Paper text:
Cobra cytotoxins (CTs) belong to the three-fingered protein family and possess membrane activity. Their fold features three distinct β-structural “fingers”, emerging from a globular core stapled by four conserved disulfide bridges. Cardiotoxins, or cytotoxins (CTs), are one of the largest groups of TFTs, affecting the integrity of lipid membranes, and/or influencing the activity of membrane proteins and the associated signaling cascades. For the first time, a spatial model of CT13Nn with both “water” and “membrane” conformations of the central loop (loop-2) were determined by X-ray crystallography.
Structures of hexagonal (with three molecules in the asymmetric unit denoted A, B, and C) and orthorhombic (with six molecules in an asymmetric unit denoted A, B, C, D, E, and F) crystal forms were solved at 2.3 and 2.6 Å-resolution, respectively. RMSD for Cα atoms of molecule A of the orthorhombic structure superimposed on the other five molecules ranges from 0.39 to 1.45 Å. Significant difference between E subunit of the orthorhombic structure and most other subunits could be explained by an unusual conformation of loop-2 in all subunits, except E. Previously, this was not observed in crystal structures of homologues. Unusual conformation of the loop-2 in all subunits of the hexagonal and most subunits of the orthorhombic form was similar to that found by NMR for cytotoxin 1 from N. oxiana (5NQ4) in DPC micelle. Specifically, for model E the respective RMSD value was 1.8 Å. Superimposition of subunit E and A of CT13Nn demonstrated that the tip of the loop-2 was repulsed from the hydrophobic amino acid residues 8–9 of loop-1 of the neighboring subunit B due to crystal packing. For the first time, in this work the structure similar to the membrane-bound conformation of functionally important loop-2 of an S-type CT was observed in the two crystal forms.
Author numbering: 1 to 60
Write the structure that this text describes.
């Protein structure tokens, strides 16, 4: 699993145990992401913070 970082020009290879790419958004997914990386489990959507996860190289 390669995941895109904040500028998706760049990517990192996920460490063992983390098989999701995520995008993190403030308030809305209709905005612009504020963080991009690897995670093990998509976090639940909070009232100010939102995530969309996928499981494919650079899908994020």
């Amino acid at each position: 699993l390669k995941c895109n970082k904040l500028i998706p020009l760049a990517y990192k290879t996920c460490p063992a145990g983390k098989n999701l790419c995520y995008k993190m958004f403030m308030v809305s997914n209709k905005t612009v992401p504020v963080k991009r990386g690897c995670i093990d489990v998509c976090p639940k959507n909070s009232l100010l913070v939102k995530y969309v996860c996928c499981n494919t190289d650079r899908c994020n």
